[PDB]
Every structure is written in structure tokens, then in C-alpha cells.
Amino acid sequence: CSPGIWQLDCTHLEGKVILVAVHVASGYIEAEVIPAETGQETAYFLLKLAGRWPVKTVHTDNGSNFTSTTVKAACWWAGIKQEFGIESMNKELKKIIGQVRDQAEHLKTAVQMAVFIHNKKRKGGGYSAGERIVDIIATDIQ
Amino acid sequence: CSPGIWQLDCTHLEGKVILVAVHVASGYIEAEVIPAETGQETAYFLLKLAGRWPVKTVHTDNGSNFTSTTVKAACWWAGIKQEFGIESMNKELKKIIGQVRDQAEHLKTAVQMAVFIHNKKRKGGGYSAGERIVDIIATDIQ
Numbered sequence: 111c112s113p114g115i116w117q118l119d120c121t122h123l124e125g126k127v128i129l130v131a132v133h134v135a136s137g138y139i140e141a142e143v144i145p146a147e148t149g150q151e152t153a154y155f156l157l158k159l160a161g162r163w164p165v166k167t168v169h170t171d172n173g174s175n176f177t178s179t180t181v182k183a184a185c186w187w188a189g190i191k192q193e194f195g196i197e198s199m200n201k202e203l204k205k206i207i208g209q210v211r212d213q214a215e216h217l218k219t220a221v222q223m224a225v226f227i228h229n230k231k232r233k234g235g236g237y238s239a240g241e242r243i244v245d246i247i248a249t250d251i252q
Numbered sequence: 253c254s255p256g257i258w259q260l261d262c263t264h265l266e267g268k269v270i271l272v273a274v275h276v277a278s279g280y281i282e283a284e285v286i287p288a289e290t291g292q293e294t295a296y297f298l299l300k301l302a303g304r305w306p307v308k309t310v311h312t313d314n315g316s317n318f319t320s321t322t323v324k325a326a327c328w329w330a331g332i333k334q335e336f337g338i339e340s341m342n343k344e345l346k347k348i349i350g351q352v353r354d355q356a357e358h359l360k361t362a363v364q365m366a367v368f369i370h371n372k373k374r375k376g377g378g379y380s381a382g383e384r385i386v387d388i389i390a391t392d393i394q
């Protein structure tokens with residue numbers, strides 16, 4: 111799968127909104143709890159994501175997520191295109207969030223604990239998602 | 253320089269607070285505009301950072317940044333130690349922020365544009381910071 115492809119969705123938990131990005135090739139995730147499910151929050155999240163990784167295309171399971179002018183501006187500026195030509199991790203990450211939830215006060219804190227647990231887990235049968243993304247991208251540079 | 257070492261500081265711009273993390277070995281940056289210069293914001297930022305990269309030690313130019321129990325809890329949970337045994341990028345990133353500032357409404361938007369510009373720049377004399385971090389970490393896995 112192309113190293114430049116990401117998937118972005120929002121899930122809902124405890125009346126809050128979790129924006130989840132998945133690097134499709136590796137299974138690596140990054141997430142944030144956002145104060146509203148809005149184009150502006152999506153646009154801002156995409157700018158951060160694009161500054162870190164070489165983001166070429168983004169897919170989502172809710173196409174209307176990407177109609178706002180604010181999202182279109184962020185994909186224009188960062189040189190991102192929509193991927194139409196294509197988990198849920200939102201289940202497995204939700205599973206981890208449930209497992210750690212009582213260990214933190216704020217949902218956002220549990221989310222980041224779950225991201226960390228997910229990305230560091232050896233998928234032995236055996237590198238972790240965090241190891242795979244770095245390998246996939248580094249290899250693609252060369 | 254060790255691949256696990258990061259530097260974290262806050263700068264101030266327009267009465268807001270910018271938390272800046274630098275991966276010392278590569279020059280890669282990540283940043284966020286935070287609503288207050290507080291231990292809780294620092295702790296939360298460290299949890300996100302640690303879920304993405306293999307963070308072993310963190311340095312800062314203001315040691316009192318790391319005294320709060322909330323920061324100590326985040327370094328405990330994520331397995332991070334303080335680096336005492338050690339730019340400013342906060343100048344060069346501030347320079348880029350100034351260069352793009354009028355192109356965005358919100359300071360936070362300009363910050364992320366400046367992060368993106370910084371990380372993608374070929375340092376030809378020639379890989380970018382974003383390319384170096386991924387190479388440094390991938391190589392260290394192997």
C-alpha cells in the first residue's frame with residue numbers, strides 16, 4: 111500500500127469527539143480529542159499531520175468530512191489530494207481506551223495512552239506500528 | 253547524538269504560548285499553541301510525543317518546566333527520563349512564523365505552517381529534518 115496514504119475519521123466517546131488518523135501501510139495512529147466535529151478542526155489537524163509525515167492522499171469513511179472550504183484550503187496548501195480509490199481501528203483503539211480509562215481523569219489522557227499502547231505493540235507472528243511507519247517512510251526516501 | 257533525545261521549551265508570541273519540541277539529532281520539530289504555560293499542558297504534550305517517537309530523555313532550557321507532579325507522572329508512565337547532560341530553533345521557527353504570519357488568521361495556523369516549512373526544507377550543502385528523523389530512528393531499530 112502506498113506510504114503516502116492516510117485514513118482520517120472521527121469517533122464519539124463520552125459526548126466528546128476523537129479525530130483518528132491511521133497510516134494505512136503501517137497501522138500507526140495519531141489522534142486528538144477535538145472540541146467540535148467541524149471542518150476547521152479537521153483542517154488544523156491535517157496541517158499538523160502534513161508537517162510531520164509525507165502525506166500524499168487522505169481517505170475517510172465519511173466523505174462529507176472533507177467538503178468544507180477550510181479542509182480544502184489545508185489540503186491545497188500542504189499539497190494533499192483526496193484518496194477515493196480505497197479496521198475499523200476505531201474499534202481496537204476504542205478497546206484499548208476502555209482498558210485504560212479508569213487510569214486517567216480526562217478522556218483525552220486515556221486516548222493518548224491508548225495511542226501509545228497501540229503504536230508500541232510488537233505485532234509478532236514482529237515489529238510495532240511505530241517501527242513500521244518509520245521503516246516504510248525511510249525506505250521510501252531511498 | 254542519541255536518537256532518543258528531545259528538547260522541549262515554550263516561547264511566547266502575541267500573548268499566546270508555543271510549546272516547541274526538537275528532536276536533537278535531526279532538527280525535526282513538533283509544536284502546539286497551548287492555552288496556558290502549565291504542567292498539565294506539558295504532561296499532555298509529552299504523552300502525545302511519546303506515543304509517536306521513541307522518547308528516551310527530554311531536555312529543556314527552563315528546568316522548572318519539569319517540576320510539576322503532572323509532568324513527572326507523564327515521564328513515569330511513558331518511561332521518559334530527564335536529560336541533564338546536554339538553536340534556539342525558537343529563533344529560526346520564529347523567523348518562519350513571521351514570514352508566513354499574514355497568510356493565516358490564527359497564530360496556531362501560522363505555527364503549523366512554519367513547522368511544515370522547517371521540517372520539509374532540504375538542508376543541502378542535503379536531506380530535510382523530516383527525512384533525517386525517520387532515517388535516524390529506522391536505522392536505530394536495526
Ligand SMILES: Cc1nc2ccccc2c(-c2ccc3c(c2)CCCO3)c1[C@H](OC(C)(C)C)C(=O)O
Binds near residue numbers: 321
Ligand atoms: C488531570 C491530571 N491530574 C494529575 C494529577 C497528578 C498526577 C497526574 C495527573 C494526571 C496524569 C498525568 C500524566 C499521566 C496520567 C495522568 C495517566 C497515565 C499517563 O500519564 C492528570 C491527567 O491529565 C493531564 C494529562 C492533562 C495532566 C489525567 O487526565 O488524569
Ligand SMILES: Cc1nc2ccccc2c(-c2ccc3c(c2)CCCO3)c1[C@H](OC(C)(C)C)C(=O)O
Binds near residue numbers: 154357
Ligand atoms: C480560520 C480560517 N478560516 C478559513 C476560511 C476559509 C479558508 C481557509 C481558512 C483557514 C485556513 C485553512 C487552511 C490553511 C490556511 C488557512 C493557511 C494556509 C494553510 O492552510 C483558516 C485558518 O484556521 C484553521 C486552520 C483553524 C481553519 C486560519 O488561521 O486562517
